[PDB]
Design a protein around this ligand. Structure first.
Ligand SMILES: O=c1ccn([C@@H]2O[C@H](COP(=O)(O)OP(=O)(O)O[C@H]3O[C@H](CO)[C@@H](O)[C@H](O)[C@H]3O)[C@@H](O)[C@H]2O)c(=O)[nH]1
Length: 468
C-alpha cells in the first residue's frame, strides 16, 4: 500500500512513537478495505441489569490501596464539535474558573484533606500541551513538575483522505493534517513512554481516569476497595442514562459466552440512531470514569507485544472541520472504554449521577454554567438536588449554537437560571438577558431574522415562545 507507506513516512518525519505507527497501519489496512467501525443494532443485545455502588461498597477504607492509586485526567481532545482548536478544559465554567481550575483545586483539596500526595497526570496532545502548560503557571505546585511528573503526551496520527487513504495535505494550516488518535491511546502511551514502568516501580498499582470535561469525577476509595477485592483489571463507572445523554457510549452485550461491548457515537450507523438514542433500551451510559489495575495492564501489554486490539472507529470529517467544502477525511480513533472486554476481569457498576457532569456540547456547557450545577466543598460540580438526578434536557439549534461563537450570542447578556428546568429547546437566533428564570418545559422559537431578546428578569414557566 502506497497510502500506508505515505502515512508511515509522514509519521516517522514528525517523531511519532513506533508502536503507534504500527497500530495505526493495522487500522489503515482495515479501513482501506472498507471497514466502517460500525456496531449495528442487530449485532448486540441490551444490558438489562448491573450492580449498583450502594450494594457493592462497604464501610471502612483500605488506605494501603489509596497509597497505590494515581490520577489521570484526559486533556488531549481538540473540541472540534464545539468549534475549538485546542483544550476545552481552558473554557470558563463558573466564577472565572475554567475546567482546569476545578481539576487543580479538586486535587489540592484531595491531597490536603487526606494528607496524601496522590500522583496526578494530564494526558495532553500536540493541540493542548502548550496552552495547558502556560495556564498552569497559576498553579506552581503543578507547573514546577509539569514536564517531569504531570504531562503524559499522547500520539498523533494523520487524517487520511476518504478517497485514496493518503495522509491529507492542508497548506493553509498544516496543523489540520493531524489528530490525536482517541483517549483509547492512553494504554500504549503509558506503556511506550515508560510512565507505566516508572509508576509500577514506585509501587503504584491503580489508576483512576476521567474526562477533562467531567468535574463530577471522584476517586472513591470504597470502589477502589471493591475492585481490588474482586481482583478486577478494569472497572467502568456507568450512570442510568437520561434524556441529556446523546453523545458518548452505551454498554451492550455480544455473544458462545456474553462479553461487554461499548458502542460509541462514531460506531453507530446512521440507520441505527433511533435505537442508539433509546435511553430505555440502552440505559447504561459510560461516564468514562475508569479504574485500571496497572500491573494487569503491564501484563497484557507485554503479552500482546504493545498492541491492544481496541476496535478502530472510522470517523468521517472534513480536514478543516469549520469548512464543509474542504477535503473529506477519516479520523481513525480508539476509546479507552473499549478495553472493558480486553482485560481478564472487568466490570461495570452503576454510580450516582453526581459523579458525571459531562460537557460534550455547548448545550451541556450552558447547563454547567447555569445554577443547575453547583460547586461542592470538595470542589466538584454536581447537578442540583431539585433536578432529582435528571439534568435539564437542552436542545440548542444546530445551525446557531453548535459552535462556541454562536453559543456566545445566546448567553452574552446572561446565563439563565435552569435549576427548575426539565427541558429547554431553542430554535433560530435568540439572546438571553439577565436573571432570566427557566422553569418546567420551555420552548423558544425565533422565525424572524432579528435576534429575539429575552428581557432581563423574564420568567419562562412551562411556556412556548414563538416569534414570527
Ligand atoms: O485523542 C483524544 C481524544 C479525546 N481526549 C479527551 O478525552 C475526554 C473525552 O473525550 P470526548 O470527545 O469529550 O468524549 P467521547 O470520547 O465522545 O465520549 C467519552 O465520554 C463519554 C462520557 O461523557 C462516554 O459516554 C464515552 O463512552 C467516552 O468514550 C476529553 O477530556 C477529551 O479532551 C483525549 O485526551 N485524547
Amino acid at each position: 500500500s502506497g497510502a500506508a507507506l505515505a502515512c508511515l513516512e509522514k509519521m516517522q518525519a514528525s517523531g511519532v512513537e513506533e508502536k503507534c505507527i504500527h497500530i495505526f497501519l493495522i487500522q489503515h489496512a482495515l479501513v482501506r478495505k472498507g471497514e466502517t467501525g460500525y456496531i449495528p443494532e442487530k449485532s448486540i443485545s441490551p444490558v438489562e441489569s448491573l450492580p449498583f455502588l450502594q450494594g457493592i461498597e462497604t464501610k471502612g477504607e483500605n488506605t494501603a490501596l489509596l497509597r497505590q492509586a494515581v490520577v489521570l485526567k484526559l486533556n488531549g481532545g481538540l473540541g472540534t464539535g464545539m468549534g475549538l482548536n485546542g483544550p476545552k478544559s481552558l473554557l470558563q465554567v463558573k466564577n472565572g474558573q475554567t475546567f482546569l481550575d476545578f481539576t487543580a483545586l479538586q486535587l489540592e483539596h484531595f491531597r490536603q484533606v487526606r494528607n496524601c500526595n496522590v500522583p496526578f497526570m494530564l494526558m495532553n496532545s500536540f493541540s493542548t500541551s502548550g496552552e495547558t502548560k502556560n495556564f498552569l503557571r497559576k498553579y506552581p505546585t503543578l507547573y514546577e513538575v509539569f514536564d517531569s511528573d504531570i504531562e503524559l503526551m499522547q500520539n498523533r496520527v494523520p487524517k487520511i483522505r476518504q478517497d485514496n487513504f493518503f495522509p491529507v495535505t492542508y497548506e493553509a494550516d498544516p496543523t489540520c493534517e493531524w489528530v490525536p488518535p482517541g483517549h483509547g491511546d492512553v494504554y500504549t502511551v503509558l506503556y511506550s513512554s515508560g510512565k507505566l514502568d516508572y509508576l509500577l516501580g514506585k509501587g503504584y498499582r491503580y489508576m483512576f481516569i476521567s474526562n477533562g470535561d467531567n468535574l463530577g469525577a471522584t476517586l472513591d476509595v470504597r470502589l477502589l476497595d471493591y475492585m481490588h477485592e474482586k481482583q478486577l483489571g478494569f472497572l467502568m463507572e456507568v450512570c442510568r442514562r437520561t434524556e441529556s445523554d446523546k453523545k458518548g457510549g452505551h454498554l451492550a452485550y455480544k455473544d458462545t459466552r456474553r462479553r461487554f461491548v461499548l458502542r460509541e457515537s462514531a460506531q453507530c450507523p446512521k440507520e441505527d440512531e433511533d435505537s442508539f438514542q433509546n435511553i430505555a433500551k440502552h440505559c447504561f451510559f459510560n461516564t468514562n470514569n475508569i479504574w485500571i489495575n496497572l500491573m494487569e495492564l503491564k501484563k497484557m501489554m507485554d503479552e500482546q507485544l504493545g498492541v491492544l486490539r481496541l476496535p478502530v472507529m472510522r470517523n468521517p470529517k472534513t480536514v478543516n472541520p469549520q469548512d464543509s467544502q474542504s477535503t473529506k477525511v477519516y479520523q481513525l480513533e480508539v476509546a479507552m472504554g473499549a478495553a472493558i472486554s480486553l482485560f481478564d476481569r472487568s466490570e461495570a457498576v452503576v454510580v450516582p449521577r453526581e459523579r458525571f457532569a459531562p460537557v460534550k456540547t455547548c448545550s451541556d456547557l450552558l447547563a454547567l454554567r447555569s445554577d443547575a450545577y453547583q460547586v461542592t466543598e470538595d470542589q466538584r460540580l454536581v447537578l442540583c438536588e431539585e433536578r432529582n438526578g435528571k439534568p435539564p434536557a437542552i436542545d440548542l439549534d444546530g445551525e446557531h449554537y453548535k459552535m462556541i461563537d454562536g453559543f456566545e450570542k445566546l448567553v452574552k447578556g446572561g446565563v439563565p437560571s435552569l435549576r427548575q428546568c426539565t427541558s429547554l429547546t431553542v430554535r433560530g437566533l435568540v439572546e438571553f438577558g439577565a436573571d432570566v428564570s427557566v422553569r418546567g418545559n420551555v420552548v423558544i422559537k425565533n422565525l424572524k431574522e432579528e435576534p429575539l431578546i429575552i428581557g432581563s428578569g423574564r420568567v419562562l414557566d412551562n411556556e412556548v415562545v414563538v416569534v414570527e
